[PDB]
Amino acid sequence: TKKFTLMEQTLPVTVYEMDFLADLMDNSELIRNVTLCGHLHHGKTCFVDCLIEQTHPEIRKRYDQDLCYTDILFTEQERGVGIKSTPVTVVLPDTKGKSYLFNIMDTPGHVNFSDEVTAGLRISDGVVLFIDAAEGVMLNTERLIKHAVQERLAVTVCINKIDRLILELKLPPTDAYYKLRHIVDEVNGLISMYSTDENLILSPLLGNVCFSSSQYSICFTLGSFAKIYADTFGDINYQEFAKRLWGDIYFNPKTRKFTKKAPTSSSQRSFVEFILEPLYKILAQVVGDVDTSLPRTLDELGIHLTKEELKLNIRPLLRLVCKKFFGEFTGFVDMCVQHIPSPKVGAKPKIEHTYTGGVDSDLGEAMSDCDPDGPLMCHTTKMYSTDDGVQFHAFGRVLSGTIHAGQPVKVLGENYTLEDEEDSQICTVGRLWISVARYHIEVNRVPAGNWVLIEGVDQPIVKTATITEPRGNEEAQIFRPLKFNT
Amino acid sequence: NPKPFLNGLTGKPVMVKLKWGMEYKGYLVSVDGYMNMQLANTEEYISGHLGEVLIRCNNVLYIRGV
């Protein structure tokens, strides 16, 4: 046998039922098509592992090793690097508990593997960039910022590996705030000099910068952490506290108000005093006072833990403490819902940038409507192999229509045009596979705004292809090929 | 406070007349702190014998304790 699968033949619980996800995938309004990208080894795979630990109840990371859920080829496990990009469709709740479908395209951070990132750009509608806090912005992150400017997608930034400033660098809170503010300033300057549009300027106050540590399951925005303070004391407003945290906003404890100037000497900001210093004291109580004042700190946070959890080693105990402190991941859900549009919302510039026929053609507005009815025309760019490697399966978003398994589909190549009908090839779809990383879901009806693997169309496709109805066909043009960064 | 009166009326027989003429006589099993009552083997009219029933917080105009 060929052991190149990493396949889960069983289906896990994933907390919720399958039919709630099946009802959520009919929307294409609460569905967010987002590519995770960044530099090499920035905890993006461990971040998707943290989302799998949130959603899948029985799937947990081991203490000794960091698992890699998206990396499913054996070559990725051998080399110890992400190689092939992976899509995951999941139901995610925000701080308000509203369920949103997430079509996530986790990509490797390698510029020689940036072709997969360009394919994930062509499928997805939003981009989340991972930044290591100790390292900052490097060459592949710069080139992906340039390609995101060219691809015209909504980009939000999560800053990963924030524990390297703390445990590994031992920075003062003022200097750590200075480094993070300089990181935000250089990202905003790079957006200014690549992007000609300056309405998007990324700030933690504006809901653009999330903070994360994917080896300890830390993910919060200012709104999420002010929601944590609101759940502690509900007298505050978490929206105004997220407005008043970042950016030289100094707390005045005599008036209990907020100024733009420090009221006394060595007065720190609301961001520093309410986020950086208590998290530093939390980690100091972990790594210095694990037996003396750790249950005192646990009761101060309102968390109850058993004795064997306190007898654990420091890193999985700290991961469990941060998981119980921040709950599940909700700031990222608000990040990709409130600041990254739906296929229905942001359909227009992607189909403008991709379709050679444009959005001005009637099939163009049928594309931009994100219609579950109407034409069944799609674009499959990434076209994976299988576990045995004998047969192949396509993968793509559905720009409009509903794919059915057994419903016939004509596939058209890149060289297809209105006089070249030779690239047209008709096959019915064998099965429709909603792609999670280590398992796939057999579904029947796939509407617009949805990512799905296609079985049985693997013959005429070379790299990318367009997907149309074989009968009742109209003037269907060909989407633009994947122009690579390299 | 009516908390000890509700604790006494819990598991005890009484009648309750509502604003809409709903008079229900029977054994109230449990009444909450906001006077959300629950009854067993009661006969109501406004109807017949309902048996196990419940009420809202203040839907009854007057509770005649038997």
Partner: protein
Amino acid sequence: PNVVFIKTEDPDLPAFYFDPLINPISHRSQEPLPDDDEEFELPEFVEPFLKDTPLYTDNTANG
């Protein structure tokens, strides 16, 4: 990813201290700020979580 770990010599230095062996940031356009003390003054009994807790111990850097 390369381990760049600061190693301390004395416990006189704090556990959150700028090492001069680290190259300085030299950080160099405004911020979207709300009204300063015109709205949303904080209520009574709101506080950071570990404001009573001290910053660091001598065994903190040991850990």
